[PDB]
Amino acid sequence: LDAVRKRPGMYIGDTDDGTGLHHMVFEVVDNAIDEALAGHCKEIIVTIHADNSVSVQDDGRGIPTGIHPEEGVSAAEVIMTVLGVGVSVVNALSQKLELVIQREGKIHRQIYEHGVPQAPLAVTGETEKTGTMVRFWPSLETFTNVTEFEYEILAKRLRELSFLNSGVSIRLRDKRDGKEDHFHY
Amino acid sequence: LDAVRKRPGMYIGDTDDGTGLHHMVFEVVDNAIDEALAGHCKEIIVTIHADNSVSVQDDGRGIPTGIHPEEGVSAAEVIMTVLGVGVSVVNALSQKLELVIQREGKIHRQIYEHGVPQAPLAVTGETEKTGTMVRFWPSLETFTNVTEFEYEILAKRLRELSFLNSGVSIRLRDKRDGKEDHFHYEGG
Ligand SMILES: COC(=O)/C=C/c1ccc(O)cc1
Ligand SMILES: COC(=O)/C=C/c1ccc(O)cc1
Ligand SMILES: Nc1nc2ccccc2[nH]1
């Protein structure tokens, strides 16, 4: 991930005019949408939190949690730390990243800072649901000038996605001012 | 560098009792002494700055600055970012690291934050001297509880080291209070 950290613009887009910032959301969304396709109901929820983080929940099968045979860590971790641009890029450029995977009756959690895992992916409880949730706080060492999520920028792109991913429900919620939308084609 | 960041303890030692913190200094010093040893006048200057960074200056030949054939960046950057424990470990666990290399008539400068280079190594100017200066600000996200350098721990070690390195002048300066020491042993 150091290659992403040293030239973030080359991976995510302009880091000063809001371009890169928004592309962080879109990259997570692309992954989430593909999760939703493969598991009944087929809905994602994109939230702009008051603290300027964005979360993206899917009702998919859950990113795989088992130990990757070659890397020695969970498969989810491999995905978050090893170089569509990939979610590893978002993680690398995030001051904090929270990951919650619901899979095979189990809740798994892991926290990252600037792409470094704080601990291994751990089972924290039981659940009847499946899905993946990623909340990230964009690093303010990378993202300058435009540092706040703009609702309409996210809305425009998600609208386009709904048409292209038919049957996938896309919800957008803004906790700063209560704005919400529901794209479903 | 991510392997270090992931488990800092395994590389630098204990990040909570001051051991690791001071080990950062010693690792740099070891490299500096190796540099000073290859030159003739042989001097190193260790300074504790008032912002709790430490700088180490040597009058060696300067860390090589040419682009590394396979890595695609200057040799200095390869040394600072590709993993005693290696200076790359110090860089990784430093919130800021300033690198100044005087070599082949030219001053070279680069800044790192948490091991990440802010720009490629750049020729900023000219010089008649040679040497390598590294100044680092320990990461307070890594180093907890003991976060300030204790002059006495540095002095004791630098005094011991001076006996093992004949001809090498080691100066210790604390800009917080003005304390200075000069350890120079001529043996051999
Ligand atoms: C298993 O396939 C993958 O790489 C999935 C990645 C992924 C899924 C959801 C998300 O919010 C971010 C990343
Ligand atoms: C080939 O040299 C190396 O690997 C490292 C050299 C070096 C590191 C720190 C310092 O203050 C001076 C020199
Ligand atoms: N890799 C890395 N980059 C960082 C930037 C700020 C704080 C901690 C960090 N760790």
Side-chain angles (χ1 to χ4, degrees), chain A residues 2 5 92 113-116 139 141, chain B residues 2 5 92 95 113-116 139 141:
Chain A
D2 268 355
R5 297 190 188 97
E113 286 174 34
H114 302 276
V116 184
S139 179
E141 295 162 4
Chain B
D2 266 334
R5 307 207 176 88
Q95 39 187 71
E113 296 180 9
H114 301 273
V116 179
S139 175
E141 303 175 359

Side-chain angles (χ1 to χ4, degrees), chain A residues 20-86:
Chain A
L21 191 81
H22 292 91
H23 293 10
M24 295 270 282
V25 180
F26 304 148
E27 184 56 30
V28 176
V29 163
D30 278 10
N31 290 284
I33 280 179
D34 288 343
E35 290 295 308
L37 289 170
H40 343 261
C41 182
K42 312 167 201 287
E43 177 158 280
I44 77 166
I45 307 171
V46 179
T47 312
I48 307 181
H49 299 262
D51 71 351
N52 197 59
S53 62
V54 167
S55 58
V56 188
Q57 174 82 253
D58 63 60
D59 58 4
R61 292 166 293 100
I63 288 171
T65 62
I67 300 300
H68 192 282
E70 283 130 30
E71 301 286 334
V73 297
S74 83
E77 179 165 329
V78 181
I79 289 152
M80 297 301 321
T81 56
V82 169
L83 292 214
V85 112

Side-chain angles (χ1 to χ4, degrees), chain B residues 4-6 8-15:
Chain B
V4 176
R5 307 207 176 88
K6 208 194 166 165
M10 295 215 321
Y11 294 88
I12 205 59
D14 187 299
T15 59

